[PDB]
């Protein structure tokens, strides 16, 4: 029933203020049974409880580790709640999760985080963002073996992570594979997205990839035809 | 500060496996609110155990858990291939905000334990090698794309050859990453100039994996 949407992923500069929003569906935040919690996961590390808020009390609680640099707010007109972390450093860069804390009974002090969000990726860098360049990896006699044929998009020179690639507006999902990105010496990321398809669909059926770079607010649509 | 946990624990299919989470007195040793979270690469965590023993709705009986003193245990019986993910223990705790004052509520997580399943069938990588597009060449760039999907275990060796001779400069290769089907994928990139591309007969990408080798070859045409 419960569904939690976090804001889009993002770049934040050092010594500036991180701010994330979490939209709640299926249950009210004004509720009495649930604390609403923020948790982050550092790259290649375990989880870290950031802080939570309980509405009926109005009391917020935080992890002393953040030196009181974090604050949690609520907005009932939209049934959403937000986290604000100030004076961020490279050590605050992470994948931020928003979760619902639920107990067995109101008498119980604690509980567990049953429902989580997909997570927003927050990168901390003074360097500017950059939208991706999208080159077509065209199908050919090389990317073929009998009845199957592989075609793709090269998403090159972009920063920061992540990027959302789709094919034909999220319709074609059969055979799609997006590889994780390489980190070039320049600091810019690059990745490929390839879809495997029938061979008898290259001349007729059209294939369009849709690349979305939210960190830099770029959206590219590219058609990948067979070379001619 | 995080709860102590073994970096990795492994077991063969069908058998039971146990993951111990060592805490303190201010949590687990003190409180009943210990829980477990499963996290596949690289989705969000999901609840599987809470209040030491109880399972949420939708979780199989295979996932059991217990507590003793200041240590909790997660016992997975009837082990399967889909139970290959990261498992974190969490606990309710209490801490002092300032040096003094009432102890504020908090939660503490574990380091995490990587569960590996034994005796999975080895898989050979599907290799692809794309040449530079005309558009990229127009931009004065040139990148050969060597994609390596669906192999097991996650150990592979990539190499690039200009015509028949190896090349080391310009090579950028991803580390293997776990797929949903527990197999591994990876990709490699060879950045050149249009001059290097058009002034050679062929370019090749070698993939070596468990005795098998696969060399893909492209050419400027």
Residue numbers in the entry:
A (entry chain H): 1 to 35, 35A, 35B, 36 to 52, 52A, 53 to 82, 82A, 82B, ...
B (entry chain L): 2 to 9, 11 to 27, 27A, 27B, 27C, 28 to 95, 95A, 95B, ...
Per the authors:
CAP248-2B extends the interface target to include the gp120 C terminus, effectively encircling the base of native pre-fusion trimers. CAP248-2B was predicted to be derived from the IGHV4-31 and IGHJ3 heavy and IGLV2-14 and IGLJ1 lambda chain germline genes, and displayed modest levels of affinity maturation, with 13.5% and 9.7% nucleotide mutation in the heavy and light chains respectively. CAP248-2B possessed an average length CDR-H3 of 15 amino acids, but had an unusually long CDR-L3 of 19 amino acids.
We determined two crystal structures of the unliganded CAP248-2B antigen binding fragment (Fab) to resolutions of 2.0 Å and 3.1 Å respectively. In the 3.1 Å resolution structure (not influenced by crystal packing), the 19 amino acid CDR-L3 formed a β-hairpin which was stabilized along its length by seven hydrogen bonds, and protruded ~15 Å at a right angle relative to the other CDR’s. The tip of the CDR-L3 ended in hydrophobic residues Phe95C and Phe95D that were angled by Pro95F and immediately flanked by residues Ser95B and Gly95E which may confer a degree of plasticity to this region. In both structures, the angle at which the CDR-L3 extended from the Fab was stabilized at its base by germline conserved hydrogen bonding interactions with CDR-L1, as well as a salt bridge formed between CDR-L3 residue Arg95I, and Asp50 in the CDR-H2. Overall, the CAP248-2B antigen binding site displayed substantial structural plasticity, an attribute that likely contributes to its mode of neutralization. The unusually long CDR-L3 of CAP248-2B was specifically angled towards the viral membrane but its tip retains a level of plasticity that may assist in interacting with dynamic viral lipids.
